[PDB]
């Protein structure tokens, strides 16, 4: 295991600057006490966390009782696909009308719910119809509640575009985050768009994002970015901690019973320079998911 792990880390771990020290320490550990996968995992996990403080980097073994399947993920989300988008304008409007639920709550508070993030190629096709369903009806409102408590996310490709409806229309765009993918040399700065289709909500009106423990992937990134940019108040539960920033590497060591290592290959550096380690968005106002809408209304009322 140790040999495969050091190789996997050197080539794929997001924080390349920690590799020299890891290569020094890992081979120097006392391994004459461990003789089971579970022990090897636990021992290396304790040492890796002491050296890295990165919870995304974790050795995990299968259920020891059924070693063909383990705690290595489930499966990538299935949202609306670009090859399945209707051609007819009436059908496209109708589909947008069921994807996005928009209400004007008493006191002129906008409510927006949607429960997936589609790829930006899909949002491109739906954009003209989203103007009618979302962006125009909420223009009258002075505050907006975005409900993501039922949103398990999807691709993050349209997250910069969506965020830009809550930003200044002008140029230059605002820096959202920077990606550093170790597997290559990404260092790609991600910016807002200078032009959106339909009316932006703007940067001034109050925005409140509702979260649950089921909130996942792109929805967590959208919530985190609305928080990191100080654009909205996050309300609800700590989110699922499922971001698409890691890859799973099996240990071909069958004596070690079905082990694998999940390695962050991507570092997400926000606009304040903070590295986000995922594990869940932490709300500004932590409440159970059922209480989040009430709490957002309270915050609005007593502003």
């Amino acid at each position, epitope marked *: 295991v140790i040999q495969r792990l050091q190789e996997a880390l050197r080539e794929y771990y997001t924080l390349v600057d920690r590799v020299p020290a890891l290569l020094s320490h890992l081979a120097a550990m006392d391994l004459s006490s461990v003789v089971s996968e579970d022990d090897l995992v636990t021992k290396l996990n304790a040492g890796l966390q002491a050296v890295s403080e990165d919870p995304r980097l974790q050795v995990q073994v299968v259920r020891p009782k059924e070693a063909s399947s383990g705690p290595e993920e489930e499966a990538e989300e299935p949202p609306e696909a670009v090859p399945e988008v*209707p051609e007819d304008e009436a059908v496209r409007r109708a589909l947008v009308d069921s994807v996005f639920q928009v209400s004007v709550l008493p006191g002129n508070v906008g409510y927006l719910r949607f429960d997936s993030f589609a790829d930006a190629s899909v949002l491109e096709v739906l954009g003209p119809y989203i103007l009618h369903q979302v962006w125009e009806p909420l223009q009258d409102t002075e505050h907006l509640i975005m409900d993501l408590r039922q949103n398990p996310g999807g691709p993050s490709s349209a997250v910069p575009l969506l965020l830009s409806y809550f930003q200044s229309p002008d140029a230059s765009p605002v820096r959202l985050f920077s990606t550093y993918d170790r597997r290559t040399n990404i260092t790609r700065e991600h910016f807002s768009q200078t032009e959106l289709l339909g009316r932006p909500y703007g940067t001034q009106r109050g925005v409140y994002l509702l979260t649950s423990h089921r909130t996942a992937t792109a929805a967590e990134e959208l919530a985190f970015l609305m928080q990191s940019l100080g654009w909205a108040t996050l309300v609800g539960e700590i989110t699922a901690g499922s971001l698409l920033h890691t890859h799973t590497v099996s240990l071909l060591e069958t004596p070690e019973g079905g082990l694998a290592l999940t390695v962050p290959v991507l570092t997400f550096i926000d606009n304040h320079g903070e590295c986000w380690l995922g594990g869940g968005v932490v709300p500004d106002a932590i409440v159970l998911a059922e209480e989040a809408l009430d709490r957002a209304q309270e915050v609005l009322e007593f502003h």
Partner: antibody
Amino acid sequence: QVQLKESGPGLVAPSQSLSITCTVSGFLLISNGVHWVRQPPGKGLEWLGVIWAGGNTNYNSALMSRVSISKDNSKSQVFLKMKSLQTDDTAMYYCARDFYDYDVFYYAMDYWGQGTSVTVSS
Amino acid sequence: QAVVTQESALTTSPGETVTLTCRSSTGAVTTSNYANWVQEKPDHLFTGLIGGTNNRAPGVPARFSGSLIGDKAALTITGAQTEDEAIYFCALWYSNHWVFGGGTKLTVLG
């Protein structure tokens, strides 16, 4: 050719459950969605829900809680489960195909099944 | 809410033009509601006539047309025939659900 046939229990008791099957033929469920519609005696039509090709479902909000739709791609079957029956759930239950691959995008219920009569009584 | 209403009964005679309307409780009917018109024939024979406001299904007679008349969807029968005597249902799409109207009972004299 495109056909939809419903089959259900006929008689069901108040406060119990209802399960109906829509068997389709002439088209694949992996490519087409299916809607469930009901017609209470001497009433108009009422939409219950749809299950799209990709598996997403949408429900009439009024029913939302008591209804559940599912399918079997390989089997060419769509199912509707309805709970907490009251005698006002007495109706002709229909399945209809969902279609949108037109010249201009629009959703349409293009082919309708023949219906199945459900009597909710004690 | 999202209550669709239609006239409940209309009567015509062969060769005349009749217009059936469909109204949304929520506001003006738009293209995005994809008005569908379904025909009910004795002993629950349902046939889709028009989809997406104005698209006549291929097997339907050319005398059936659909349009947006102001704030409502309309089904016009130009030169009504005795076999047009049926119940006509209107359905409107509201982004995540369909809502059917009450139906119009059309009587054709002669």
